[PDB]
């Protein structure tokens, strides 16, 4: 029914901006651009023998962010240099930002957690870089009307 159109402007995936270290990322893969996850659930429940229930608030909010890039992309070079930079000098952190075109944003600092699996074949491959983000609270700021 036309009275329940959830998006009056078509969702254009190109509006989703990602900035790492202050430069705009580009050269993404075929299907998925990014994935953001947490490691720990929000609260812990300790239920007693007779049904007494008490809850605790978590204090580890770190998450992991995956970034799919075609292995022919130029940005593979910048990340590869950065790994060695941090391994020797010991400076790992780097600002990270995400723009939620019509969804949830993100703005924190992160570091390269692991390097992907490089494979060469008859087709242009793919790479999944893991950018661990220090704090992973999604922000609704892009949405209007949030009272």
């Amino acid at each position: 029914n036309q009275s329940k159109i959830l998006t009056l402007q078509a969702y254009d995936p190109a509006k989703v901006l990602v900035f790492i270290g202050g430069q705009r990322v580009s050269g993404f893969a075929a299907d998925t651009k990014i994935v953001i996850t947490r490691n720990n659930d929000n609260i812990s429940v300790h239920a007693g023998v007779d049904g007494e229930i008490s809850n605790a608030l978590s204090r580890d909010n770190t998450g992991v962010m995956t970034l799919s890039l075609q292995n022919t992309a130029k940005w593979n070079g910048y990340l590869a240099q950065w790994q060695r930079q941090a391994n020797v000098t010991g400076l790992i952190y780097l600002p990270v930002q995400v723009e939620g075109s019509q969804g949830l944003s993100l703005n924190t600092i992160g570091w390269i957690q692991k390097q992907p699996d490089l494979s060469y074949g008859t087709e242009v491959g793919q790479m999944d870089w893991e950018i661990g983000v220090l704090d992973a609270w999604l922000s609704p700021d892009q949405i209007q009307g949030i009272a």
């Binding site: 060695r84 930079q85 020797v88 000098t89």
Partner: protein, 67 residues
């Protein structure tokens, strides 16, 4: 002394590989698919011994450039 040692051993290492590669037929050839191996040839004999013994420096600077 370091410069003389590096020069002598680089010449030695290149010549030894080239001759051994030309003694089985299959002599080296000037092509983009055959020249890169000189990277390994040089990186093997002098450089990887100099680094281990500590004569050649390595790491990162501040100039903000790798050694």
């Amino acid at each position: 002394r370091f410069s003389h040692w590096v020069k002598f051993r680089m010449e030695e290492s290149v010549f030894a590989y080239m001759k051994r590669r030309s003694d089985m037929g299959l002599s080296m050839k000037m092509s983009d698919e055959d020249l890169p191996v000189l990277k390994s040839v040089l990186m093997n004999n002098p450089i990887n011994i100099g680094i281990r013994n500590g004569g050649i420096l390595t790491g990162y600077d501040t100039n903000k450039v790798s050694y």
